[PDB]
């Protein structure tokens, strides 16, 4: 799928987005790819952080549904008006689809200054779309209206170091292959875990390790409430109990250096002289997921290069600085960009499963690399899922 390879732009901490056009004549907009929601929405009125926005009055194909819509996210929220219009993806399959579109009229802490995206593409299921499950999500409309296979895959590429606005604009930020899988985006084998239920892209974690050492918690604690794959979330987010235990372990593994509590809470950056970041003192983190085969599991392992996110501390500073991107949640585990930047993730909706393979663009050093390995069968499974 050469045509779609490299169709994403973006950065760590900012958001990965794809170019789409809406209405007639086509209006071009950068749309954030978000597997943590199911609404297709675009800025539709002026906003400080928006360089452009959808102008319904200039689209001859716009259809006003005369209904309001409200969408609150873990971070940010917005309000808008529902309609439908023709939508296309310049660097995706060659099709045009009539889709539901939330025209954003008011928002709070949703749009990000300097992000370059103006809308969001909720790729999860109807069950969680607002106002309710009757508002057909975009991917669903795409599959019903075309011959595109009911599957998409994502490769989000972090850089390992900061990028200014010009570099971010002139750089490839990943690929979103619509309807298929591109072997050039990963190495090794693709391991699949079941989509537990079709609402969020829900999965079940069966074990967690920090540098091979078992966190040793009841696996229900790992999925307490739920565990999901969310490309629209920056961090690897963990339930309070798991988070406290994981952080105590990461601290113990990296104790040759002491960091303020603010670092561990993600409130302050840590910096080292240019090129001297001590990646090796930080542990790798492994999450074991249920396999498709009964009593079988596999694990995905990330490196500190995935969980210590680069941040530019000023313009002529000779320091490499980062923020700890693992934080706590009171709404289950959220495998955000920190996990996704390490793997090629296949959302196989047709077979209700998610595949993971080491990403061809994941960041690493000469000594360690991200990994996807299995199978494991000593595993004490299911009672791991929450109810
Ligand atoms: C179904 C829907 C009504 C609710 N579902 C969501 O809220 C889900 N998350 C999807 C939203 C989508 C979104 C929200 C705001 C701006 C852009 C997209 N994402 C978040 O809620 C979310 C986004 C962000 C975030 O900054 N996302 C940006 C755009 C981003 C940067 C880098 C990579 C990917 C995304 C952060 C966090 N934090 C919780 S954190 C500090 O732990 O990572 C959460 C999930 C938490 O259930
Ligand atoms: N995310 C990006 O901007 C990529 C990563 C390396 C340079 N381009």
């Amino acid at each position: 799928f050469v045509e779609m390879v490299d169709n994403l732009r973006g950065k760590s901490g900012q958001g990965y987005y794809v170019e789409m056009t809406v209405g007639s004549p086509p209006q071009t907009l950068n749309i954030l790819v978000d597997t943590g929601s199911s609404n297709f929405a675009v800025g539709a009125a002026p906003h400080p952080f928006l360089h452009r926005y959808y102008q319904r009055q200039l689209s001859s194909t716009y259809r006003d549904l005369r209904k309001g819509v409200y969408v609150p996210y873990t971070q940010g929220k917005w309000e808008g008006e529902l309609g439908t219009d023709l939508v296309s993806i310049p660097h995706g399959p060659n099709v045009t689809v009539r889709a539901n579109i939330a025209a954003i009229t008011e928002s709070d802490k949703f749009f990000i200054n300097g992000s370059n995206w103006e809308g969001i593409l909720g790729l999860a299921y109807a069950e969680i779309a607002r106002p309710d499950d009757s508002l057909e999500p975009f991917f669903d409309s795409l599959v019903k209206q075309t011959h595109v296979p009911n599957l998409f895959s994502l490769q989000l590429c972090g850089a390992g170091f900061p990028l200014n606005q010009s570099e971010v604009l002139a750089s490839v930020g990943g690929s979103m292959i619509i309807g298929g899988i591109d072997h050039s985006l990963y190495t090794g084998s693709l391991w699949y875990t079941p989509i537990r239920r079709e609402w969020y892209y829900e999965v079940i974690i069966v074990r967690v390790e920090i540098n091979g050492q078992d966190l040793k918690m009841d696996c229900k604690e790992y999925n307490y409430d739920k565990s999901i794959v969310d490309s629209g979330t920056t961090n690897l987010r963990l339930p309070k109990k798991v988070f406290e235990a994981a952080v105590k372990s990461i601290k113990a593994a990296s104790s040759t250096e002491k960091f303020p509590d603010g670092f561990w809470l993600g409130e302050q950056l840590v910096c080292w002289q240019a090129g001297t970041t001590p990646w090796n003192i930080f542990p790798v983190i492994s999450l074991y997921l249920m396999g498709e085969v009964t009593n079988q599991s596999f694990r995905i392992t990330i490196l500190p290069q995935q969980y210590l996110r680069p941040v530019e501390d000023v313009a002529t500073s000779q320091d490499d600085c980062y923020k700890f991107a693992i934080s706590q949640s009171s709404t289950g585990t959220v495998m955000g960009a920190v996990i996704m930047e390490g793997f090629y993730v296949v959302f196989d909706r047709a077979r209700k499963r998610i595949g993971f393979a080491v990403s061809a663009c994941h960041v690493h050093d000469e000594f360690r690399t991200a990994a996807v390995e299995g199978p494991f069968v000593t595993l004490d499974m299911e009672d791991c899922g929450y109810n």
Side-chain angles (χ1 to χ4, degrees):
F1 302 73
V2 299
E3 191 193 316
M4 292 175 281
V5 158
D6 286 1
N7 57 3
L8 303 184
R9 285 202 301 168
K11 171 183 191 171
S12 295
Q14 291 309 254
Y16 293 89
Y17 62 83
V18 67
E19 185 171 90
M20 298 180 87
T21 69
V22 296
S24 316
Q27 284 171 52
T28 302
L29 299 170
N30 290 152
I31 308 298
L32 178 99
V33 303
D34 171 34
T35 59
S37 67
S38 313
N39 282 85
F40 178 31
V42 297
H47 185 288
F49 307 159
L50 299 189
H51 282 127
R52 57 199 171 167
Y53 57 84
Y54 172 43
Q55 291 181 293
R56 286 169 290 175
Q57 77 276 190
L58 304 180
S59 173
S60 54
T61 46
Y62 162 69
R63 287 175 181 177
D64 180 0
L65 288 169
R66 298 186 64 88
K67 188 164 53 179
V69 60
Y70 167 68
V71 180
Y73 298 106
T74 292
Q75 175 182 292
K77 68 170 69 161
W78 56 255
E79 168 155 40
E81 297 165 346
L82 295 164
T84 68
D85 211 329
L86 298 185
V87 181
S88 292
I89 305 177
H91 304 293
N94 202 300
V95 303
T96 295
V97 301
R98 179 164 289 275
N100 286 316
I101 306 180
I104 296 177
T105 49
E106 294 179 293
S107 68
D108 178 59
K109 295 174 176 164
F110 178 59
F111 298 118
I112 304 187
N113 192 174
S115 71
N116 205 42
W117 51 262
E118 303 120 347
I120 184 170
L121 180 61
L123 287 162
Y125 306 91
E127 154 104 310
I128 63 186
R130 300 308 181 90
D132 64 78
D133 56 44
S134 71
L135 188 74
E136 185 172 87
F138 177 86
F139 205 75
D140 294 81
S141 304
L142 172 64
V143 173
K144 274 167 198 54
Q145 296 169 41
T146 73
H147 291 122
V148 171
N150 189 26
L151 175 165
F152 68 90
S153 59
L154 292 179
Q155 179 195 63
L156 311 187
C157 304
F161 55 87
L163 301 158
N164 59 45
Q165 169 83 64
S166 74
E167 297 174 272
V168 164
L169 298 179
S171 305
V172 165
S175 303
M176 169 168 68
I177 307 308
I178 310 283
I181 296 175
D182 191 286
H183 315 300
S184 87
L185 305 174
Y186 68 103
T187 59
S189 299
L190 270 163
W191 278 84
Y192 294 87
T193 186
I195 283 178
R196 184 191 191 194
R197 213 237 289 179
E198 299 160 300
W199 60 315
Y200 282 98
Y201 279 103
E202 194 193 356
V203 297
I204 288 176
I205 293 165
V206 296
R207 172 180 169 104
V208 175
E209 280 168 15
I210 304 292
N211 258 0
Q213 180 172 297
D214 186 5
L215 225 50
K216 211 163 179 191
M217 293 174 64
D218 185 309
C219 59
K220 250 174 174 60
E221 298 291 339
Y222 298 142
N223 313 286
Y224 170 41
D225 179 288
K226 59 171 164 305
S227 286
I228 65 174
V229 178
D230 182 358
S231 70
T233 291
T234 308
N235 294 2
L236 160 58
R237 303 188 62 225
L238 304 162
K240 177 75 185 161
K241 262 196 92 155
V242 177
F243 173 78
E244 294 178 327
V247 173
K248 178 184 177 190
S249 191
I250 294 167
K251 282 184 171 174
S254 64
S255 60
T256 52
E257 274 179 52
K258 290 305 192 297
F259 311 101
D261 302 311
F263 171 66
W264 301 109
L265 290 179
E267 302 287 337
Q268 69 190 90
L269 67 170
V270 65
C271 301
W272 291 274
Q273 201 178 77
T276 70
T277 309
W279 302 110
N280 75 94
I281 73 174
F282 291 93
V284 298
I285 297 174
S286 295
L287 302 178
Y288 288 70
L289 301 161
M290 186 173 293
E292 283 201 281
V293 168
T294 308
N295 301 313
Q296 190 166 98
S297 70
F298 65 93
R299 69 185 176 208
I300 66 180
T301 302
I302 56 165
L303 309 182
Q305 283 93 339
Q306 279 61 251
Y307 69 80
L308 303 187
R309 156 178 87 77
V311 173
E312 185 60 280
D313 169 50
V314 191
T316 190
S317 168
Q318 295 302 15
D319 276 21
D320 284 337
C321 306
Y322 316 73
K323 162 179 182 182
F324 182 63
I326 299 183
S327 52
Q328 58 183 293
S329 172
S330 58
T331 64
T333 295
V334 180
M335 300 170 52
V338 169
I339 284 292
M340 301 193 70
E341 289 181 2
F343 316 94
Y344 178 42
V345 193
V346 178
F347 293 79
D348 187 336
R349 297 151 62 92
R351 299 171 70 161
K352 188 171 172 178
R353 61 188 188 161
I354 302 184
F356 288 79
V358 171
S359 171
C361 70
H362 83 275
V363 187
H364 66 270
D365 53 51
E366 197 182 47
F367 313 101
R368 296 193 293 204
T369 219
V372 179
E373 304 162 326
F376 303 92
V377 296
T378 53
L379 40 80
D380 167 42
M381 298 184 166
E382 187 76 80
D383 65 341
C384 284
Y386 184 72
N387 287 302

Short mmCIF file of all heavy atoms in Angstrom, two decimals, residues 207-216 249 252:
data_model
loop_
_atom_site.label_atom_id
_atom_site.label_comp_id
_atom_site.label_asym_id
_atom_site.label_seq_id
_atom_site.Cartn_x
_atom_site.Cartn_y
_atom_site.Cartn_z
N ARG A 207 -0.24 -9.69 32.51
CA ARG A 207 0.94 -9.63 33.38
C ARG A 207 1.74 -8.39 33.03
O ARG A 207 1.70 -7.94 31.91
CB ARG A 207 1.80 -10.89 33.14
CG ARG A 207 3.18 -10.93 33.82
CD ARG A 207 3.92 -12.25 33.49
NE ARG A 207 5.34 -12.25 33.89
CZ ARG A 207 5.82 -12.87 34.96
NH1 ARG A 207 5.00 -13.56 35.76
NH2 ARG A 207 7.12 -12.84 35.23
N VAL A 208 2.43 -7.82 34.01
CA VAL A 208 3.26 -6.63 33.76
C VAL A 208 4.63 -6.85 34.41
O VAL A 208 4.71 -7.30 35.55
CB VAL A 208 2.64 -5.34 34.37
CG1 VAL A 208 3.61 -4.17 34.18
CG2 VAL A 208 1.30 -5.03 33.73
N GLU A 209 5.70 -6.53 33.67
CA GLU A 209 7.07 -6.66 34.13
C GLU A 209 7.84 -5.36 33.93
O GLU A 209 7.58 -4.62 32.97
CB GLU A 209 7.83 -7.73 33.32
CG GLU A 209 7.60 -9.19 33.71
CD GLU A 209 8.16 -10.13 32.65
OE1 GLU A 209 8.94 -9.64 31.80
OE2 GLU A 209 7.82 -11.33 32.65
N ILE A 210 8.79 -5.12 34.83
CA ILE A 210 9.69 -3.95 34.75
C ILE A 210 11.09 -4.60 34.80
O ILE A 210 11.47 -5.16 35.83
CB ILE A 210 9.54 -3.01 35.94
CG1 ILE A 210 8.08 -2.57 36.06
CG2 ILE A 210 10.48 -1.77 35.74
CD1 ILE A 210 7.64 -1.70 34.95
N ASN A 211 11.82 -4.52 33.69
CA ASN A 211 13.12 -5.17 33.53
C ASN A 211 13.02 -6.63 33.93
O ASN A 211 13.83 -7.15 34.70
CB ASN A 211 14.25 -4.46 34.29
CG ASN A 211 15.12 -3.59 33.36
OD1 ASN A 211 14.86 -3.53 32.15
ND2 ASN A 211 16.12 -2.92 33.92
N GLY A 212 11.98 -7.29 33.41
CA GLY A 212 11.79 -8.71 33.68
C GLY A 212 11.21 -9.03 35.05
O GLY A 212 10.80 -10.17 35.28
N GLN A 213 11.15 -8.05 35.95
CA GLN A 213 10.60 -8.33 37.26
C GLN A 213 9.09 -8.10 37.32
O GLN A 213 8.58 -7.00 37.08
CB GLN A 213 11.30 -7.50 38.33
CG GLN A 213 10.77 -7.75 39.74
CD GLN A 213 11.63 -7.04 40.76
OE1 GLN A 213 12.79 -7.36 40.89
NE2 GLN A 213 11.07 -6.05 41.45
N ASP A 214 8.41 -9.17 37.68
CA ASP A 214 6.96 -9.22 37.77
C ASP A 214 6.42 -8.24 38.78
O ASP A 214 6.86 -8.22 39.92
CB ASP A 214 6.55 -10.63 38.18
CG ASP A 214 5.04 -10.84 38.15
OD1 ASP A 214 4.32 -9.93 37.73
OD2 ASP A 214 4.60 -11.93 38.54
N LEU A 215 5.46 -7.42 38.35
CA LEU A 215 4.83 -6.50 39.27
C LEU A 215 4.04 -7.34 40.31
O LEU A 215 3.76 -6.88 41.41
CB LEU A 215 3.89 -5.58 38.51
CG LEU A 215 3.97 -4.10 38.87
CD1 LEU A 215 5.44 -3.58 38.86
CD2 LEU A 215 3.08 -3.33 37.86
N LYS A 216 3.70 -8.57 39.93
CA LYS A 216 2.99 -9.50 40.81
C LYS A 216 1.67 -9.02 41.42
O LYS A 216 1.43 -9.18 42.61
CB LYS A 216 3.92 -9.96 41.94
CG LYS A 216 3.62 -11.37 42.42
CD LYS A 216 4.79 -11.91 43.21
CE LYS A 216 4.49 -13.30 43.72
NZ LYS A 216 5.53 -13.73 44.72
N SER A 249 8.88 0.56 41.14
CA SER A 249 9.82 -0.34 40.50
C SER A 249 10.78 0.35 39.52
O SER A 249 11.98 0.02 39.46
CB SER A 249 9.04 -1.44 39.80
OG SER A 249 9.92 -2.46 39.40
N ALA A 252 13.30 2.18 41.55
CA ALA A 252 14.28 1.26 42.10
C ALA A 252 15.32 0.85 41.05
O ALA A 252 16.51 0.72 41.35
CB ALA A 252 13.57 0.00 42.65
#
